[PDB]
Write a protein that binds this ligand. Structure first.
Ligand SMILES: Cc1cc2nc3c(=O)[nH]c(=O)nc-3n(C[C@H](O)[C@H](O)[C@H](O)COP(=O)(O)O)c2cc1C
Ligand SMILES: Cc1cc2nc3c(=O)[nH]c(=O)nc-3n(C[C@H](O)[C@H](O)[C@H](O)COP(=O)(O)O)c2cc1C
Ligand code: NA
Lengths: 199, 202
């Protein structure tokens, strides 16, 4: 593993992934385990739920995405979409799904009515924190990964397919696999416009 | 201490600390470099770079917590305010400094106008990138030997904060992170069973 800061700087968006893993599946699980154990949540509420799809379940997820898009995308746009999914995400080793348990969120809103407007946002925040931790650690072991949002289109089909609770709200999908091309250009705005220091 | 842990070790190390003091294991410039690294490399939707971070040290740190006290004075009566003041003074104000996390609403609005199809996603995505920055800074601050907590005295203080440091009106405050060298260790943390929270299917 790199240092925290090195691992963070290493993390990029990869679309050009393949269906190979440098680590055993149990170590991929242990990444997710580590994030879910230690990434913080408001009130220690532990609303985050992670589903790791590998092998044929990974392929099924991307089939669900394609089938969902077929319903809302005219034929030609679909054909381009299909080839792009098939040549990036669906070619990967696996996909991480991030959900937020709405029973927890609703429970906190009911139990702590003074903070009730804050819990949905705090739930989205802890989800994003888990997303960054997983993203970095997957790349640290040598995968490439991207962060996708084909929810809320797919959410009911995903919950149906893997028998997930109806109250798990899908946030993001993170396909990953060994990369075959390097990241491209990234623009950076000046740090001095975005950071102020006052003593 | 200054030498970094691995990503996983740094993440596991990170805990909430309320018992902090006004000392630093590192020079101020290295505190700034932690923020710099987070703001450079933490992702944002569309590479939109909506996060804005204000680091308060010294007298500015103390002023922030004085603003929080004064805000609470307005909504917390009498004897009970005395307890709140002592708790702020003994938990956040006694730290070395405070990180403030903002999101640039001109950036968000700009995205919503340029990409109307995605307009309802940008505010959520902005909150998400904010949280990613918050974790990165939290973890790195603790790795160098600080304790830190994550506070939400916004939206009570937000106008007073923007007034006091002359910050743009379109910077929306998300969270405040006081930090300092810790004087007590973290307490008990409950963990729900991981198999209720993680599923693996192949
Ligand atoms: C909240 C958020 C949402 C994003 N949504 C998408 C997405 O739906 N599709 C996608 O391909 N990339 C998405 N990205 C990736 C960003 O565009 C990307 O991280 C940014 O352009 C910086 O590139 P990097 O990841 O290589 O550092 C998202 C990133 C974040 C932080
Ligand atoms: C989104 C979010 C909001 C939080 N809000 C507060 C808060 O306002 N005040 C506070 O003292 N701690 C707050 N916390 C800290 C959590 O209660 C804490 O992270 C959780 O109990 C786990 O403890 P740990 O941070 O020691 O791992 C927050 C954390 C998160 C992730
Ligand atoms: Na360290």
């Amino acid at each position: 593993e790199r240092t925290f800061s090195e691992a963070l700087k290493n993390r990029r968006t990869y679309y050009s992934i393949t269906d190979q893993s440098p680590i055993p599946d149990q170590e991929i699980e242990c990444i997710i385990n580590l994030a879910v154990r230690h990434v913080p949540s408001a009130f220690n509420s532990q609303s985050t739920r992670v589903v790791l799809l590998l092998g044929k379940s990974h392929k099924k997820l991307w089939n669900i995405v394609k089938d969902a898009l077929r319903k809302i995308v005219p034929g030609e746009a679909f054909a381009k979409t299909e080839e792009k999914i098939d040549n990036s995400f669906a070619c990967g080793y696996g996909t991480v799904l991030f959900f937020e348990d709405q029973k927890v969120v609703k429970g906190l809103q009911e139990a702590f009515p003074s903070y009730q407007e804050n819990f949905p946002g705090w739930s989205l925040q802890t989800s994003a924190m888990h997303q960054l931790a997983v993203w970095v650690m997957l790349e640290d072991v040598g995968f490439g990964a991207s962060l996708q949002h084909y929810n809320p289109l797919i959410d009911d089909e995903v919950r149906r397919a893997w028998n997930l609770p109806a109250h798990w709200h899908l946030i993001a999908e993170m396909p990953f696999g060994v990369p075959v091309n390097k990241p491209g250009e990234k623009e950076f705005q000046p740090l001095e416009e975005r950071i102020k220091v006052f003593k």
